[PDB]
């Protein structure tokens, strides 16, 4: 199962195997086909959270549409139950995008200090994201530290 | 100066007012077992004695909330329907 | 110095990721006709095989999108409803 | 004319509306900056290509050093 989430992961992460639709279709039909004679569905689930995970916080644009073709086959295949779980994620990021959108709002407000640039940040919840390990702790760029105070702050 | 940095793509984590020095239901800790454990051993037999934590980023013991279903079906610092999005701490 | 600059009132164009190089319905080009095309000539008989743009900033061959009209009937790249603003790079 | 050729100039004005929604962006956060002295007023429109045909074959040529940091700044944001 872990090497079928990577499977999956290479095919969604760019369109380069197949630009047209068709082609995309017939594949995940097939990689869904070869998953329902599968067991221990569980790390199946954990890798493909993992996954998103890994694509969701690195550079955008990996297809937003596709995703919907995912949640719908996930739906199709396990039901309301693990990709619930994947549903409740997607729903973070459309906070972390929107609490994005109010902190560059809030920029627009101040626009004093250099502190604040392009301060992209994204706001998540502990439950949906694993823990990298202890949340690690060392000295930051300060412009950017008191950025990330004055985000806090708000 | 050589190096400067232009654009900063942080990811905050947040967290609500879970107390993790007073269990909201049982008033011990966020960890050190529960009222109805007390002791760390106290006839274990596996199972287990973690921390649980909901979709509203609140975080409890899992017996302490186990039991909690009992009584209501609502976290009680919020009015939101508690779901197991993660288990220990 | 004798003349500077004071306002400027550049006008900027922007595209979005059409993939000049890769064709997003026929993975060939921006330009030099298409799958269903292929050869320069591939008996021409006037009619065209130039570049199509939509509203949406999006340039496929207007081959690609006029056959892909009978499949869907929004752009492929975003959820809009695909126009025909231009016709041609 | 009729709803045809006025669908495409109201398409027109949707673009105009767009170019001075992404200028007050971008002004908004040059004040932010404010790192070298090329913008000391800048008014930038963002068009669409399909409403507004190519002039000729897209020219360049040197910027003057003011637009140059201008232009980078608008382009970084
Ligand atoms: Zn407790
Ligand atoms: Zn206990
Ligand atoms: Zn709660
Ligand atoms: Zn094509
Ligand atoms: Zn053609
Ligand atoms: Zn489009």
Known sequence: PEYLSLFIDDKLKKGVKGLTEQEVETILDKAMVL????????VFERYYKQHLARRLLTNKSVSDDSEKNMISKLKTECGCQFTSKLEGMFRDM???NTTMDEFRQH??????????????????????????????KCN??????????????? | KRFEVKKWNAVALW????????????????????????????????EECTVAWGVCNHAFHFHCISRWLKTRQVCPLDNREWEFQKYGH
Not at chain 1, 35 to 42: A, G, I, L, V, W
Not at chain 1, 110 to 131: E, H, I, M
Request: net charge negative.
């Open chain 1, 35 to 42: 998953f329902r004679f599968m067991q221990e569905k569980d």
């Open chain 1, 94 to 96: 459309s906070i972390s």
């Open chain 1, 107 to 136: 920029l627009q407000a101040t626009g004093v200090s250099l502190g604040g640039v392009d301060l992209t940040v994204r706001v998540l919840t502990t439950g949906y994201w694993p823990t990298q390990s202890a949340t690690p």
């Open chain 1, 140 to 154: 930051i760029p300060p412009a950017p530290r008191h950025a990330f105070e004055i985000f806090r702050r708000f």
């Open chain 2, 15 to 46: 967290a609500w007012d879970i107390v993790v020095d007073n269990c909201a239901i049982c008033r011990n800790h966020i960890m050190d077992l529960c009222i109805e454990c007390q002791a760390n051993q106290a006839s274990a037999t596996s």
